Structures are given as C-alpha cells and as structure tokens.
Amino acid sequence: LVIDHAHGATLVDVDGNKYIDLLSAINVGHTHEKVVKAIADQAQKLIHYTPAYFHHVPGMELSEKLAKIAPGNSPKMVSFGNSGSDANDAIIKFARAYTGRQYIVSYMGSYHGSTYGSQTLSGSSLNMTRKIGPMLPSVVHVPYPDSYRTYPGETEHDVSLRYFNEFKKPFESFLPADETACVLIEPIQGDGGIIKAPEEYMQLVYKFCHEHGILFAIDEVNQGLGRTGKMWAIQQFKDIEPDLMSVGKSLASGMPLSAVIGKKEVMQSLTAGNPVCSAASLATLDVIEYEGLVEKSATDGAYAKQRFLEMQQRHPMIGDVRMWGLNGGIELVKDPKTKEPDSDAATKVIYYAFAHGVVIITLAGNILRFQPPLVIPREQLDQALQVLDDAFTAVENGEVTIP
Amino acid sequence: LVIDHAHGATLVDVDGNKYIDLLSAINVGHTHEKVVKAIADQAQKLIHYTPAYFHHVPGMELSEKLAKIAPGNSPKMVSFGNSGSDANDAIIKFARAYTGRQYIVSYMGSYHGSTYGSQTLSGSSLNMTRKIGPMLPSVVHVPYPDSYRTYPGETEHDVSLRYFNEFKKPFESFLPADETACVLIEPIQGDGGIIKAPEEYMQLVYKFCHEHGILFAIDEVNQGLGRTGKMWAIQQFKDIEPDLMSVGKSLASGMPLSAVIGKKEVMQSLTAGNPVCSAASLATLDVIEYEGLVEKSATDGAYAKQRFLEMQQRHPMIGDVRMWGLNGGIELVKDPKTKEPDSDAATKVIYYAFAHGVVIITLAGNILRFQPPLVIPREQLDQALQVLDDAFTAVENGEVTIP
Amino acid sequence: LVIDHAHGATLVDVDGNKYIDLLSAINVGHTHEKVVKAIADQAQKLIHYTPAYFHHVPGMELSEKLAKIAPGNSPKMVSFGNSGSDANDAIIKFARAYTGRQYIVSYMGSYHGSTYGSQTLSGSSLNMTRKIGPMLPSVVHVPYPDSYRTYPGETEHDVSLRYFNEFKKPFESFLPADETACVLIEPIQGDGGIIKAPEEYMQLVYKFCHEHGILFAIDEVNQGLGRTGKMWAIQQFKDIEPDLMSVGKSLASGMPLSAVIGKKEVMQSLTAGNPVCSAASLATLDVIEYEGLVEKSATDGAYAKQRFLEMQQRHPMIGDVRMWGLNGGIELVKDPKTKEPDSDAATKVIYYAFAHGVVIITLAGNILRFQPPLVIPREQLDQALQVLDDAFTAVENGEVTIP
Amino acid sequence: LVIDHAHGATLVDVDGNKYIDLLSAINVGHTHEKVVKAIADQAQKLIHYTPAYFHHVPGMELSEKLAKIAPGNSPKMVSFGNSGSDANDAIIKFARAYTGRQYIVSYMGSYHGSTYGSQTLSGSSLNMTRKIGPMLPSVVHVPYPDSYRTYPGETEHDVSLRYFNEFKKPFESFLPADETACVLIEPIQGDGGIIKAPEEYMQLVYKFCHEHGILFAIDEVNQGLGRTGKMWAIQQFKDIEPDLMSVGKSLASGMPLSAVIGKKEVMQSLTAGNPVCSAASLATLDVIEYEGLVEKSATDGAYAKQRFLEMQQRHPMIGDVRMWGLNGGIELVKDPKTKEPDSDAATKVIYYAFAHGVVIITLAGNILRFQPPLVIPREQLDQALQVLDDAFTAVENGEVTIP
C-alpha cells in the first residue's frame, strides 16, 4: 500500500482511504501546522551548512532548550545526530572517554539502533545481528525485569530483587565494575513490549552505578517527549538524574534529528544539527508544551488503561494491559493461567482493525502496540478503541481469516 | 560567527556580510529554488511515517532513479539511511552477510563516518578514536597511494606497483583473503587531501577482489554526484562496477539522507527514507541533470586547475595542485624540493580569504580544500580565485598575522 | 615456606616438617614410584624433538589410550598441549572451525585458564581480567546452577528449570543459536566452589545444543581422571557424550601436558606431546587403573561425605557439604538460615590445620577445598579429618588468631 | 617415521638409522648428560606442587639466574609459563596492565604462538587463523624489513628508512601512539625466514617507543639462548634494553617451560614453574655457559656462513645466505636477478639430505632452515654441510625425484 498524505492521527492512502494511526516519531501527530511552517520558513533561509566558522540560530536555541528540559538540575550539554542509532553510539563514546573504561552494559529485550555500536547494545531482533558479526567488543547484556511472567507468588519487591541479583552476577564473575563505563537502560522498554521496570529495581541499579563510578545512561528514543505522561520516561521514577540520555527523531516530528543530552563534564570528555530539522524540532517542542501533550498523554493514558482493563474483563485473550501515558502494550495470551503467547490472535486483531480503518502492529508476535499520536482527538481515540473491542469479539467467535 | 541565510555560493552572516562558499553536501548550492519548493510541498503532505504497511512515492521514485544512475549495468537495490556514517556501517553488514566472511579492509587516510563501524574503517583523525576503543573487530587498514611525496624517480607505474604490493602484504601474512568480505575505497580520498588513486592501482585491487571473492566497495559520500566531473568518482576509472557504494547527505542537498546502492544479490543478503528528505533528493538530482552540473564541474574544474597551476608558477609555496572537477587540493609546502608541510602558510591563507569574503578551510594543516558548489557562477569563482592569489602574495610578503 | 620433597599425600619442607596434602594435578599423589621411573627412563632416550618427520611411541600410545577411555563410543582424536589453558583455547578453535560459527558460551563461576581465550571464557577471578582487555570477542557468559543458595521452597527441578531459563534468555535476545559454535561447561565447577550441576539441567543444555547444531564441550581439567569417583565428571550424568573435552596437567601428574579429546570429525576441522611428559602420563594412567583410584575416590568420597556430614551436626558453621569422589567443598557460613559467608572462620580453619600439619586452602573466601591425592592412605585421611574437626572446635571457641 | 632416541646432534629411528639434526628447542643438543640427570634427580624429589604456601628451590634459583642474564642492567622479574605461546600472551597482559593502554603492534612474518593472544600477534601461517576468528582485538601488524628483495639501488639505510616509514603510517592514521601498550618484535624473525632487522631500523622503533611511552618487547623464543652467537638476539643490536622479553622451551631443552623477563615495575603491574622443568633449565643454562655455546655458535656460525657463501659461488640457485650464529636461512631462487622463489628445488634438497642422513626443513617453501644444536661436533657439521653441497649438485643436474 501507498500513503499519500496524513494529518493528526489520520493517514490517507493514494485512493483516499482513511485510517487512524495507532503507531514512533509522531508525538505531535502528522503534519502539524506549526511544524510544516517551520520547515518551510527555514528551508527558504538555510537548508545546510558545514559547521566550521559558523553557527545557526535554530541550533543554538534548540540546544539551550533541550539542556533545560532535560531531567535533573545539573548543567548539561547537547550533541546532535541524525537518529537514535547514532545517538546511542555516541553514548558509548562519551561514556568510555569520560570514565577511561571500556565495558558497557545493556539489556536483553532492548532496541537501541542499527549502527554497529547501538546494534551491539541491542537485545531484540537477532535477525538484525545474523551474519554481520563480530559486533563491538566489551558489551554485556543483562535481563530486563518482567512483571507479567513471574514466578508463583512474586511481589514487585521479589521481582525487583531477583532481577537486581541477575544484574550483579556478571559483576561477581567476569565483568569488573571498575572497568564498566556505563549502563544503558530504557526506563520503559519499547520494542521489548512496553515493559516498565519496577521502581525499586531502578533505584538499585542507579545506586549501584554511582557507588562504582559507572555512568547511568538512559534511552528515551521511544518513550520520551511526553509519551509516558511525563516529559521523560525516567521521570516516572523517583529522583533520578542520568549522566547521559538519548533522544530520537520524535524530537523533530520524524525529521532526521537526534540528540544526546548529558552532564556537562561528561560531554566535555571528547556536533551541530541540521537547521531545517532544528526548526522542525523547535516547533515540535512548542506544540508539546502549549498543547499540554504531557498532561494529555497522562489523562488519555489513564482513560485508555481503564478502557483496556474493561475490555479485558469480557475478553480473556487479553493477558496483560500495560499503560503509562498513551503508551501501551496489550498482550494477548492463549490462556490467562499459562500465559502462552497467542501470536495468532494478535495477527488477526491487526488485520481486522486494518480492514476497519485502524492501523496498529505488534511486538513479539502477540503484544499490541498502542502509541497513537498524543494530539489524538478523543472522538478518533474512541472510534479506534471500539474497533479494537470489535476485533476481539470477531476473533473470539472465529470470524476472522487472513488470506 | 552566525550564518543567517545562504543561496548559491553565497553565505550571509547575521550582520549582512557576504561570503563566497568554497567548501561538502552542497553540490547544487545553497537554497536552490527547486529544493526549497520540494521540501515545502512535501512537508505539507507528509513529514514522517513509520514504514510497516505503507510506502511513499518520493521514496520509490528516488530509489528507482538511484538504481539506474548508479555505476554499471548490473541490477541494483537501494537502502536508505540518514548519513554517510550509517551507510558505511551498512556496507560492512551487507558485505559480511553476503559473503559469510568477516574481515574488512579499509584505507589509511580515509574518512567514512563517526558511528562505531564507519569510524573503525576510518583512517584520518585518531582524535576521533581516542579513549573510545575497543573499535569493531576484524578490520585492517592499508595505505592509500600518494602521488606527490614519492621516492626519487618513481613513475605512476612504480607508485601503483609499490602500493599494490603493500596491499598484498597483510594477505601474505595474517589476513586470509578467503575470509575478507570487502575492501572499501574512496576513489578519490577527500579528508585525506583530495588524493586520487592511480588508475593501474585501482585495476589491481579490483581484479584482486574479484579473484578472491572479496566485494569491491566504494565511498562516494564526498566525491560523488558530479563533484569530479563525472557522476561518480569511480567513473574516473576504466570499467569498474562496484558491488556496493555509499552516498551521503549531498543526495538531498545536506538534508539528512544517505544511501547504499549495490548489486541486487548482495543487497538481498540481509530500509525506506524520510519523505521530505526524499523530495529534496529528487529535486537535487534534477538540478544536477538539467543544469548539466557534471559537465559544469568538468569544465570549471579544468579552468580551476589551469588557474591554480598558473598561480603556482608565481607562488612556489604551492607544492601540488590536484584537481578533478571543481574538486581540488592545493597543497602548500615550505620548499618545493623537500615538500615540507607548511601548515602555517595555509592558516594564513584562509584567514586572509576569510577577511576578504572567501570561506575556505584546510586538510592536514597545509592543504587547501577547494570544493565550491557546482552551480557556482563564473564571476564569483573568479572573485574567489583572485582573492586566493592575493592571499598568496600577502603571505609571501609577510603581510598576514593571526590574532 | 619452601618445600623440599614429597611422596603420596605427604609434603616435606626444607626443615623436615611433614604435612598432609589436602590440595589439583595430584590424582596419583606425589612422586609415585612408576611416574618417577617413567620420567627417568624416558629422559635417557628422548627429552624433545620437533615433530616434522618423526613420531614418538609414548605419544602414539598415549594418544590411543586417551581416545579409548574418553567418554562415549564415537571415534575420537586427541590433540596435545602443555596445560588446561591452551587446551581450552584450542576448544574454541576446534569448535569455530568445525561449525563455521563464532560465538562461544561459557559459565559464570568457571575457570578455564589464563591465556587470552580460556581467560575470556572464565568467570572466577576478574582480578585476572583487570586492565588487560579487550578480551576475545563473541563470548557470552551464563550463570551456573547453584543448589545451596536457592529461593525458598525450590526443588532440584525448580533450580534446573530456573537456570535453564536463564540459559535461554541470551538466545531469546541477542545471541543467535545458529551462530553459536559451542557451550563449554565444567560438569562440576571447581574454582567455583565444587558446585555440581543438577542432572536435569545438564540434559536440557545438552539437548539444546544438539537441537541447534551447537557443540557441547566440557572441561575436566580439575574434575576428571577419577577425581569424582568416575573416570570423568561428565559420567556422573546420564548418557552424555561431549563433542570436545579438555584435560590438564593431572594427565601427567603435574608435568606440563594437556589434551583435547574430541569426536574425530570435529577434530579434523583444523599437535604431538612432549615425550617425557607423555611417559609420565602413561605411568599416571596405569596407576589410576591398576590401583583402582576411580573406585577408591568413590569409596573414600562416600566415607569423607559421611564424616563431614557428621562434623556438620556438631558444627553449625558448616553450611553445606558437597562431595562427589574425594572431591569436596565444605562451605562455611555465619548462620545456617541466612547462609552468610564466613570468610573469616575459613581463614582460621586453614591456619589451624596448617599449624597441625594439614595443608588446605579455600575457594571464594569461605569454602574449604578438599581434594587430596586419590592414593591417600586411610590413616592420613583420618588424621586430616580429625585435625579439621579440631579446627572447627578451636574456631567455635575463639581459640584461633592469625598474626 | 618413528624416532626412538637421540643424543647431541644425532637422531636414531626405531630401525637404528642415524641422522644428523639440522633443526628449535635444542640449543644444547639431545639428551645432554647434565640435563638427563637433573630431570632424574628432580623427579625423585618433586614432580609437582601447587604453589600456594610453598616455593621450590630450583624455581627461585632459576628465576634469579634469568633475572641476571637478561639483557640490560635494570632490575627484572620473571614469570614462568609452559611455552612461547603463553609467554607472548602474557606479554600482552603485562604491557596493557602497566601502561593502561590497549593496542598492540606486531609484525607481518612473525610467529609468536598458537593461543588466541600470541596467535593474533602472529603473521606467518594464516592457515593457523582460518575459520577461528574473531581474533583478539586492538592488534595491528606492520611489515618486517626485508633486506633481500628490496628496490633497485637500496642501501641498508634506505631499507631502514622505508620500513620505519611504513611503521609510522598507522600512527599517522588510525592508531594513536598514546594508546599503544607495546610493540613486539623478533630481533631476528625465525619462521619468517631468519630475517634480521637492520640496526638503524631497530634504533628508530626503539626510540619511537620510548618517546611515546610504548613498551618495547622482544620475542627470543627461537633466537635466544646463544642461537645467534650472543646470548640474546637483541644483543646483536647496540644498547637496547627491552621492557619485556619472551623465552620458550629452549630454556629447558624442550621440556615445557617458558618465561617472560621484564623490568620490575612493568612486571608488578599485574607465576612459578614446574620444578622438574626448572631443574632441566638450570642444567641447560649451565651447559650453555660452561661449554661456551654462545662463543661456539659465533665461531661455527662464521664458519657456516663462509661454507655457504662458497657453496653459493658454484650454486647459483642459492639466492641469499643469511647467518648470525649457527642460525641461518639459505634461500633458494629460480634466478639470481628475479629472485623468484624455488620451492621445488628446496623440497628436493631436503629429500636428498634426508635420504643421506641429514634432517632439515624449510621456511616459506624455498628457504632452508639451518639451526643445528649448538653443541654440534665439527665432524658432523662438516658431514652435513657436504651432504648439502651434494644435494645442490644432484638437484642442479636433475638427479632428484620425489615419489
């Protein structure tokens, strides 16, 4: 299929068919009027310049704003790239350079990018890593805490301790803490299934890092910029200021711009952004702030969560409803007690939806990924929610078949 | 300093000062009317979309065009990124995947990017590699042929054989040819000093690769899209069709878009581009074709070469004039016979120029990098050339001092 | 201190003080009469020869014997080195070469050697890895099953499933099974604390390997040659034939000789031994066979286990008694219920023992390592056991202080 | 074939056929009476002991002697292994640990061992590296100076400058000098063809290392212990004290013992030897000293060199005669002016010799390796030399055919 154009949460194919976008670099929705104008005004003045002798204003303005909105009060610096991948690659460099150490710890289930560094940190789609090794050396992966498929009787405190214990094992065997430059964590894993780490777990890792001189880095490529109902996913957690943070194309409404924002002394251990993409980004941040999208995601998120929890009541194929902001994973299982994945039911849901004007896809075969643009109007949100309920019903009753 | 706007080969700072741009993602010049309009028209329809269920038209059109204009007649496929760095990273993957081998050979003096893969292939600025290792494994660097500082009495044939002999040594010691996935070469090194490899040398390497099943890959990030007076720098060489080729932001007039273009069977061994940047790229290629910029670079290049060779006659500090298209390296030496670098004279030249409205910079301390936009009007080209002649004179007579 | 000489399980310092050896390349005891004579007879004929045109007989004889006694019935080949380290390094090569794959999986807690390959596989003493990285690429570590410090209520089946689940996580995230050349496991970890893997766990890993084309390799450097009461530690497990197996200096009574013994087709994927050390090894194997040391270790092992389990009854500082053959780990804890390690009590035990003519040391601060020579006479075994009981008493009553 | 026994420079197969040994861990010859007795006396007292609480005397004595005889006057420490491979692996660790840097530079043509570290440093037989990668990261290879196949008109000074220039290129491109822990060099390459580096070349590299804080390490596994007519091959060079040096099994007459001997402060940056092998080594060093083998190799070496240079006069297939001590490479070429290798003539020479009771082999197809035991009696040396002359004649006249 072929998309012609889009606006807000609506996609329009070449034959004029309309769909509701449930899928992300689209926090502010498609073709926001302010972003369009920023791109157009800025292309008229300056598409590109090699930075040697000169600076541009959108760049310096954007840079100053991101330093401020970044989590915590410690002074920051900002380094621009073109995508998540190259930002996460840079995090490795910044961390190594600053600490003089070489190991990096990253999580199983994570997705950090497709360049050799960020790919090596990743733990999602090995297909991505097949036949392309060796990868970057001195990287270790540890398991990300899973709150759904747990052991019988486990509290959140059990799950936090158990996983923090897995975290330490490498450090108790072959990986010297004093030679680890940083830990990189998605405060909520996206490609992993919209899996959020328990609060205590994160405090343990954080305290561990500080106690052994290891930088604490986060990836907010998918979960930042209001997606969770706070500005930054890490703000779902109590009093945590990371040393380094990555941001992706969401920054510029899907135009290719990225950043790393870090504590000044870390960033001095070792560039400037596309001006048209910087324009788009200033407009984008303005829309998030003035349209109150952080708050909107929180409020609609809580709404969505209730709507999904109620659908779950009539629809046992819904194993788990996870939602923080308009950010959710609706995990389908063949049976509530075994939690067996039902990739087949999920495929059926998205094809039904698709067929009724709702665009959505999955993670890990069986989890629906719900991340509509934050600007989504309540009417469309409700249409889409209804179509989904319907989809569950059709599938429940065997009324859905994929060609 | 701060740039406000630019058009063609003219930069304009915030105080309305004008400069002539001698510096590259600017083949078609600044703010070309067609590129501006493509960006603006396309932002109105679609800034970004996640590609899952949908394709966009600019993407498919761009893709088809690049398949065709790419060097050789073998069917091609095209894979899009956001920059040179991530394209060169991909070249590694594509090569490995296809061949099932792991080693990669790259050249000393090269610059391929700043992500961990392309950075590891690079051989220019170790500063870039300081404190950030380990780099990517299974990469070997070999020396790039230097035609200026050669041994007494050396012909182009001597230089070609000598360097091809260095090339083979690894293969005769620790690097098994049958385990090398590819060789990546800039047909003319850019960051290296605008150093072009001798024709015979390139045939040797090429034939070597084919004879041992090694993919032959080129980087045209800096030297492609008409910069040399042919479409692709590799076209300066007789009957060479690479297996893989990288292209950078020049593709979209400095908007963040890249590509790898390769033989179909290689590319099947293992994405889609930003639509606004794809729009910019279609406009950009159209300008190169209809404005005859390939031919223009050839013709102005030959003009520039004569103008520099004549300046050299009155200015012995000019050791070497290298030029293929409007693509040149004007290498300054303290003495014609010793060839000692004179980084100091070069710094003085650029500061004089700067002060007389000409923006230019250096490579390796002492080489002037001449790569103005291809659309440069002859009047400005001549102004800039004159200012340079002047600069040589001032510096010759000790009239130039840096604060 | 300085040792002058030794015989059986007795060490004698330069001042004629006698000690009982509880510490291993000493399966057959010190200075066995047959080993001494083999060394002496063979030194008279041939200390060393470069193998080019010639073979030696001890070498071919030793080779044929080890092929036969190795676990399983599949034809084998034997490749000789000088130590465990270089045998485990070779296992990596053999595995890679044969499979055409690159990743290797090894266990946390393991000790495989001190050369860069075997060191990278290791998971015991990071001190060993401090400041010497980067290590060898494409190695992943997983946790070795711990049967003592487990979760409340865990059966052996829980522990087996839980740990096999940790094993799979890498394979479910970033490590492609089809690109893993082998898994290397100590059927009982030695440096790790004399920790034996549960039977079901091992069947799972084994079946996993076979199902994904991964070679199953074992380290018997510490636990082979009758140490466990079977010839090979892997024989404690039902019907398991490894693809590769490493053996260390025990082979030649601590003379420097090692081997890898593997399935013929694996070993053809890609040397010969010191003749004097091969002589020592033939004598050594003869002593193990005719003196019935496999059986002796089993019988004395069961005796030792009862004697330790009874000491545990009066000595609660003994948290865990682990023993398979004359191969044991007597783990000291500050409290039976918390299992807190008591490194301090252990240090006190060995100093008491030492002072009463018993040489023994620890693993992980708090575990006594019991591995006397297999030939140990029952009288000495009993003396040493008694001294230990005493040591526990002294320490219990605060009668022991380290200078 | 099968060797039964040997003594001095004589090998004896199982059928009582005698051969003269021209091939090395055999500096003192086969079965020297003193070495045999040391092995036998020491096996009677102590074959092996785990070093924890105890030291042995042969170990401390050997250690003290090697500290003293090592090149230079700076205090030294000695660390023992079982072979060249594991000594060269350790050199990497020692160097890294001390400097806090990670890169290592090693030479094309070199052979340092077969464990993953020393193998990665090696540059001789890629077969050894086929299908076993990835190798150890952060290693770079540079070319070893070749004095035979040089460019027309080159002096030793040209060859020294040219090669030192190749040495620097990496450092001028991608390899930061301040991040290189050491350079490891064979002062005369053995497996490479008995190729000795020019004096000036070595001073340049040495001075380079000192000027950039890089440790200067040498391999004397093949060329040490009097092989060159000085104790250590590095003593062929003016006033050079290495930071680290490796020694192999020659130390103990082919018993498995190795060492690293280094400047004390380097060695403190981060074991003990087999007592029977340490005994053999003390005897071995005594034989070298009292039998004047350093001097003998010098004198016989000069004799051998004249005898080969004269054979060359009647035998043009001898391209190059290289000899320093009883250490030589007699390189066969198809034509004196082209220097084409004649692997075929070499194979014929060794088969003729073999057939007339002389054991010798080749390097690189066409170079005869001459390294008889140093104790060789002049009568046998002369027999063997004569047989070789004969061999050249037979081959010259087409009288030699391999089955």
Contacts with B39 from chain A: Cβ below 8 Å: 39-40, 43, 47, 276
Does an H or E element contain D282, and which?
helix D275-290
Query: ∠ at Cα D41 (D38, D42), nearest 5°?
Result: 80
Give Cα B312 to chain centroid, integer Å: 25
Of the candidates B105, B102, B126, B104, the one whose C-alpha atom is nearest the C-alpha of residue B114 is B126
The residues, ordered by sequence, that sit 6+ positions from C320 with a Cβ below 8 Å of its Cβ are C148, C329, C330, C331, C333
The A residues from 7 to 36 touching B (CB cutoff 8 Å) are: 11, 13-14, 23-26, 30-31, 35-36
> Could you give the residue ranges of the DSSP H alpha helices within D76-184?
84-99, 116-121, 126-129, 156-171
| Cα D205 to Cα C389, D210, D223, distances in angstroms | 62, 9, 19
Question: Do C302 and C222 belong to one domain?
Answer: no
| Cα D133 to Cα A207, A294, D102, distances in angstroms | 38, 50, 19
Any CB–CB contact under 8 A between A137 and chain D?
yes
Retrieve residue A224's tokens. 């930042």
| Cα D69 to Cα B165, B352, D76, D390, distances in angstroms | 41, 63, 10, 41
> Could you give the residue ranges of the DSSP H alpha helices within B4-125?
33-45, 57-69, 84-99, 116-121
Any CB–CB contact under 8 A between D134 and chain A?
yes
Of the candidates B129, B236, B136, B141, the one whose C-alpha atom is nearest the C-alpha of residue B183 is B141
Contact A25, A249 (CB under 8 A): yes
Strand partners, D68: none
Phi and psi at residue A341, in whole multiples of 5°? Answer: -70, 145
Which class for D273: exposed (0-12), middle (13-18), buried (19 or more C-beta within 10 A)? Answer: buried
Map residue B318 onto helix, strand or coil: strand
Query: ∠ at Cα A173 (A150, C185), nearest 5°?
Result: 80
Contact A239, A249 (CB under 8 A): no
Phi and psi at residue B120, in whole multiples of 5°? Answer: -65, -40
Q: What is the DSSP letter of C106?
A: E
Residue at a domain's end among B231, B263, B291: B291
Can you tell me which residue has the tokens 């420079």? D9
Any CB–CB contact under 8 A between B395 and chain A?
no
Of the candidates A307, A294, A321, A130, the one whose C-alpha atom is nearest the C-alpha of residue A223 is A294
Q: How many domains does chain A have?
A: 2
Which class for A395: exposed (0-12), middle (13-18), buried (19 or more C-beta within 10 A)? Answer: buried
d(CA A14, CA A36): 21
Is C148 labelled as part of a ligand binding site? no
Is B352 labelled as part of a ligand binding site? no
| Region at D398 (left for phi over 0; alpha for psi -120 to 50; beta for the rest) | left
Query: ∠ at Cα A293 (A288, A299), nearest 5°?
Result: 170
Q: What is the DSSP letter of A137?
A: S
- Looking at the complex, report in whole angstroms how far the Cα of residue B144 sits from the nearest Cα belonging to chain D: 10
Question: Do C231 and C264 belong to one domain?
Answer: yes
d(CA B68, CA B225): 13
d(CA C370, CA C360): 7
Of the candidates D257, D402, D353, D287, the one whose C-alpha atom is nearest the C-alpha of residue D21 is D353
Of the candidates C182, A126, D136, D133, the one whose C-alpha atom is nearest the C-alpha of residue B102 is D133
Which contacts qualify for C203-211: CB closer than 8 Å, 24 or more apart? C203/C237, C203/C238, C203/C240, C204/C160, C204/C164, C204/C167, C205/C164, C205/C167, C206/C240, C208/C167, C208/C168, C209/C182, C209/C183
Amino acid occupying residue A23 = L
Amino acid occupying residue A376 = I
Contact between chains at D43 and C39 (C-beta distance less than 8 A): yes
Contacts with D175 from chain B: Cβ below 8 Å: 126
Contact between chains at B54 and A1 (C-beta distance less than 8 A): yes
Query: ∠ at Cα B364 (B360, B365), nearest 5°?
Result: 65
Contact B218, B184 (CB under 8 A): yes
Question: Do C15 and C40 belong to one domain?
Answer: no
d(CA D29, CA D16): 19
Do the bridges between strand C358-359 and strand C328-332 make them parallel or antiparallel, or are there none, so unpaired? unpaired
Question: Do A297 and A270 belong to one domain?
Answer: no
CB neighbourhood size of A52 (10 A): 11
Contact between chains at C134 and A170 (C-beta distance less than 8 A): no
Q: Edge to edge, what strands does the sheet with D3-7 contain?
A: D3-7, D10-13, D18-21, D358-359
Residue at a domain's end among A291, A323, A348: A291
The B residues from 82 to 121 touching C (CB cutoff 8 Å) are: 100, 102
- Looking at the complex, report in whole angstroms how far the Cα of residue A45 sits from the nearest Cα belonging to chain B: 5
Give Cα A391 to chain centroid, integer Å: 26
Supply the CATH number for residue C128's domain: 3.40.640.10
Amino acid occupying residue C165 = N
Can you tell me which residue has the tokens 């609609």? A300
d(CA A164, CA A141): 13
Amino acid occupying residue D317 = M
Of the candidates C123, A98, B140, the one whose C-alpha atom is nearest the C-alpha of residue D137 is B140
Question: Do B41 and B27 belong to one domain?
Answer: no
Can you tell me which residue has the tokens 């960051």? B191
d(CA B279, CA C92): 51
Angle between helices C57-69 and C275-290 (to 10 degrees): 40
Can you tell me which residue has the tokens 């066979």? C289
Contact between chains at B2 and A54 (C-beta distance less than 8 A): yes
- Cis amide bond preceding A134, omega within 30: yes
Whole domain around residue A7: which residue ranges? Answer: 1-31+292-403
Do the bridges between strand D367-370 and strand A244-247 make them parallel or antiparallel, or are there none, so unpaired? unpaired
d(CA A232, CA D217): 52
Any CB–CB contact under 8 A between A172 and chain C?
yes
- CA gyration radius, chain B: 21
Question: Do A350 and A219 belong to one domain?
Answer: no
d(CA D282, CA A36): 84
Please report the DSSP string for A340-370 in residue order: -B-HHHHHHHHHHHHHTTEE-EEETTTEEEE
Amino acid occupying residue C390 = D
Tell me the CA end-to-end span of chain D in Å, nearest whole number: 16
Contact C191, A146 (CB under 8 A): no
Contact between chains at D134 and B129 (C-beta distance less than 8 A): no
Question: Do C21 and C77 belong to one domain?
Answer: no
d(CA D209, CA D202): 11
Tell me the CA end-to-end span of chain B in Å, nearest whole number: 16
Is C396 labelled as part of a ligand binding site? no
Retrieve residue B90's tokens. 């991909």
Contact between chains at A114 and B86 (C-beta distance less than 8 A): yes
Contact A375, A28 (CB under 8 A): yes
Of the candidates D38, D338, A120, the one whose C-alpha atom is nearest the C-alpha of residue C39 is D38
Of the candidates C382, C373, C315, the one whose C-alpha atom is nearest the C-alpha of residue C346 is C315
Can you tell me which residue has the tokens 């076979």? C210
Contacts with B91 from chain A: Cβ below 8 Å: none
Can you tell me which residue has the tokens 């794959």? C101
Q: Which residue in D100, D102, D134 is closest to A134 by CB distance?
A: D134
Half-sphere exposure of B58 (CA within 13 A, CB side): 28
d(CA D362, CA D192): 11
- Cis amide bond preceding D198, omega within 30: no
Question: Do D270 and D260 belong to one domain?
Answer: yes
Query: ∠ at Cα D182 (D178, D184), nearest 5°?
Result: 150
Of the candidates A131, A83, A82, A137, the one whose C-alpha atom is nearest the C-alpha of residue A111 is A83
Locate the chain A residue with the closest alpha carbon to B113: A86
d(CA B27, CA A210): 49
Is D111 labelled as part of a ligand binding site? yes
Farthest-apart Cα atoms in chain D, separation: 67
Amino acid occupying residue B315 = H
Contact D114, D131 (CB under 8 A): no
Contact D260, D234 (CB under 8 A): no
Contacts with B176 from chain C: Cβ below 8 Å: none
Of the candidates B331, B304, B307, the one whose C-alpha atom is nearest the C-alpha of residue B319 is B331
Retrieve residue C154's tokens. 């865990």
Contact C107, C185 (CB under 8 A): yes
Which class for D354: exposed (0-12), middle (13-18), buried (19 or more C-beta within 10 A)? Answer: middle
Map residue D373 onto helix, strand or coil: coil
Any CB–CB contact under 8 A between C126 and chain A?
yes
CB neighbourhood size of B63 (10 A): 21
Contact between chains at D4 and C255 (C-beta distance less than 8 A): no
- Cis amide bond preceding A152, omega within 30: no
Question: Do A230 and A299 belong to one domain?
Answer: no
Does an H or E element contain D367, and which?
strand D367-370
Question: Do B50 and B12 belong to one domain?
Answer: no
Map residue C399 onto helix, strand or coil: coil
Do the bridges between strand D18-21 and strand D358-359 make them parallel or antiparallel, or are there none, so unpaired? parallel
Contact A322, A329 (CB under 8 A): yes
Retrieve residue B100's tokens. 């099932």
Question: Do A42 and A68 belong to one domain?
Answer: yes
Do the bridges between strand A103-107 and strand A180-185 make them parallel or antiparallel, or are there none, so unpaired? parallel
Of the candidates B188, B278, B270, the one whose C-alpha atom is nearest the C-alpha of residue B229 is B188
Map residue C157 onto helix, strand or coil: helix
Does an H or E element contain B302, and which?
helix B293-314
Do the bridges between strand A76-81 and strand A258-263 make them parallel or antiparallel, or are there none, so unpaired? antiparallel
d(CA A342, CA C172): 17
| Cα A366 to Cα A72, A90, A317, A350, D33, distances in angstroms | 36, 33, 10, 11, 77
Retrieve residue A37's tokens. 């104008």
d(CA D215, CA A172): 32
Contact A196, A324 (CB under 8 A): yes
Query: After which residues are there C–N gaps above 2.5 Å in chain D?
Result: 23, 270
Question: Do A198 and A142 belong to one domain?
Answer: yes
Q: Interface partners of A (3+ CB pairs, < 8 Å)? A: B, C, D
Any CB–CB contact under 8 A between D152 and chain B?
no
Contacts with B176 from chain D: Cβ below 8 Å: 126, 129-130
Residue at a domain's end among C245, C272, C291: C291
Q: Edge to edge, what strands does the sheet with B18-21 contain?
A: B3-7, B10-13, B18-21, B358-359
